[PDB]
Design a protein around this ligand. Structure first.
Ligand code: CL
Lengths: 440, 440
């Protein structure tokens, strides 16, 4: 009912809302008792007035509870229920090696993920490059895999934090997207619906990032750690570098290639290593599967080096109806692009910057991403062999290998990639992959 | 399109909106091209950041030109085009007197109006307890009567400021009605579209004030005066008391009766007198039909004592198709209620408070108003011989005479009247009828 307008009026005048009041309104959104205009007004009043830590927690936990919430206490599993979440990036593929890695270390990873939003990639989209992959198993199969494999990566049923559906949509047309409380709500409500004991948040800083500035990434990470632990879920955040492409490849099929190679030890991008190992370590300590960073890293290094994690991945893949030989034979399964050639800079120099948002857009343009929610994706296109900041570039040393649908396509990404990368005469500042660790 | 959202962001960030941006939005609301959530978000940004003077004239005139705008210059009239507008209240019958009064003072008063909403009855619902009274003459009939009588009172014979409808509806459920620049536009746009040379605004203060506070009431009065003058109309406003019924009666038919009695001289409520006179003085001074209060009061006293104003009223009832002998014979025409009995307080003491809102809402529930515009008004029901603040009440002194279809609606209304009125052992302090005059 129209108690709603009174809660709006209350927030408007600068009064904090209560848990009952926030729950009412959120449930109002799910059940369509509350109009889009009422949705807009409250969002606006929250942009201006913001929200106290308690209001923030109430907002998240109300949204989480608006849908179905997962309970694994029933299954008496040997270890903690954990996950990672990330704000996104280009060539940020960490989840693919992380779920298996943590899972091979005794965690249980019910990773319910999503489709690529603009220039950033989706994890689901990458996995759909694997032939036969099912991101939508029945909830009970889903429980089988978790128990038998230890990780599964699946798509949102529709039953999950549904309040966010109408609330985010309205935010998008009303200029209320940018508010940290409303963002901490959207970001966390879904992940918390998984019934986790622990969570680590990856908050990217730099040009590629959601947040426009570092102090804002830091404000968002602190909000999230604050609200999550408040929700009963042990949580830390890492601030990690999105100033260049994290992996050496960006796309779908091409990212899954580098995932397998990483696990099997075929190839490991040192920065992608830094960020993946850092996120996992946070998962193992916050789940008491390790005493300390050193012991965490000790376990993780082993599972990664001896193929365990690779096996876990294959098994999970097999389990989700992908090839049973996929880890070994990934070669023959993944789509390859019809045109794959390197692009070279017009000058020699050291790479001193790149616009990572731009590169990411080059990939959507080639077909690797959607602008529309219904755009179809070509899984073969993208970049590989990406050059890194401070790399020496010349006629021998290409900026990247572009994978495209045709020559038309390839020439255009070749423009974007040359324009997005900046060359200098001196190897610039060498930036840390991980900036700080944020806790309660 | 959805640069509507960009307008919202601009206002949100604290900028002034252009006239152009404001007419794009206003017209977008009339034309459906902008949705409910955007309306509500913009409204809320306007609640927070207010608006400047040219913003305000832009809003009001964008609304005004969203629909037809009258022009009287063709009919070549001697004497000014002048009207009265009011935020409304229980028992405010001033229009029915003042129209004839000022018309009889040589000016032209095209009062255009609406039905009742909430606790306040519309002037047109009052005029419609007169048998046959026609609130919808067609265009030349409207023009004819004004030339002849000098006044007429009608509903909107056209669409005057259509953009106000989605905008007020959305405001009324989003807690955005309280915004002075938005109110001002609503309240003024319909009146400016009337093509007036002058206007006086009656802003009620007290328990019947539209605004939550007296100090919000001044600002409203002050904002209306500024914009109207900025819109080209010579405008002043009075802040007048609604802490109780203005007239001695409230209803439709019962109000018409007292209304007529005022004019013919049978009874004149001093407080109703105070306000009516002062509003008329404004119309005469601003419409340059007199040079100061003193001269203006002379003239209106004359037409009140010499019968010309009462006369103007009858002509106007016959011209508008109610009985032509109505002034003389009104008790033959006006329907009596089914049950008339005085209602008594259950304690003894002075009347300290009167909840006027609760009173109109008592009339509505009697069948006096309409909560749906689809209802059936019973024109007879209502209240007469209202007790007034400061009156000493005992077992022989009635709070009012109640007029109700049956004893069951009587006993419900009586309940409401005793809920309307607070007694206690000390008489309250007096209040002026008119608090202040606002010009320039
Ligand atoms: Cl008298």
């Amino acid at each position: 009912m129209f108690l709603a307008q009174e809660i709006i009026r209350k927030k408007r005048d600068g009064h904090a809302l209560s848990d009952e009041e926030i729950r009412f309104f959120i449930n109002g959104i799910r059940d369509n008792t509350i109009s889009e205009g009422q949705i807009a007004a409250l969002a606006m009043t929250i942009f201006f007035h913001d929200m106290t830590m308690p209001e923030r927690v109430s907002l998240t936990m109300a949204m989480r509870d608006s849908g179905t919430v997962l309970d694994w206490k029933s299954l008496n599993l040997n270890g903690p229920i954990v996950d990672k979440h990330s704000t996104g990036g280009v060539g940020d593929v960490t989840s693919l090696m992380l779920g298996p890695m943590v899972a091979a270390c005794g965690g249980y990873v019910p990773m319910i993920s999503g489709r690529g939003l603009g220039h950033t990639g989706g994890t689901l989209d990458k996995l759909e490059a694997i032939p036969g992959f099912d991101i939508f198993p029945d909830d009970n199969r889903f429980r089988e895999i978790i128990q038998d494999v230890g990780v599964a990566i699946i798509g949102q049923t529709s039953s999950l934090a549904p309040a966010d559906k109408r609330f985010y949509a309205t935010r998008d047309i009303t200029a209320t997207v940018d508010s940290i409380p409303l963002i901490t709500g959207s970001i966390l409500a879904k992940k918390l619906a998984e019934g986790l004991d622990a969570l680590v948040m990856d908050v990217k800083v730099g040009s590629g990032a959601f947040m426009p500035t570092y102090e804002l990434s830091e404000a968002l990470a602190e909000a999230i750690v604050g609200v999550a632990n408040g929700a009963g879920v042990r949580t830390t955040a890492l601030l990690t570098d999105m100033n260049q492409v994290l992996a050496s490849s960006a796309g779908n099929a091409v990212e899954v290639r580098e995932a397998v190679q990483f696990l099997t030890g075929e190839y490991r991008n040192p920065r992608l290593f830094d960020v993946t190992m850092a996120l996992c370590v946070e998962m193992l300590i916050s789940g008491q599967l390790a005493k300390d960073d050193a012991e965490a890293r000790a376990k993780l290094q082993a599972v990664l080096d001896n193929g365990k994690a690779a096996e876990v991945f294959g098994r999970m893949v097999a389990a989700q109806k992908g090839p049973s030989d996929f880890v070994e034979n990934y070669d023959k399964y993944l789509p390859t692009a019809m045109l794959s050639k390197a692009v070279y800079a017009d000058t020699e120099g050291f790479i001193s910057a790149m616009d990572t948002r731009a590169l990411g857009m080059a990939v959507v343009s080639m077909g690797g991403g959607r602008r529309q929610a219904s755009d179809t994706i070509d899984y073969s296109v993208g970049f590989t062999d990406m050059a890194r900041l401070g790399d020496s570039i010349d006629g021998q040393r290409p900026l990247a290998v572009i994978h495209a649908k045709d020559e038309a396509s390839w020439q255009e990404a070749a423009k974007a990639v040359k324009a997005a990368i900046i060359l200098d005469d001196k190897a610039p500042a060498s930036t840390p992959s991980v900036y700080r660790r944020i806790t309660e």
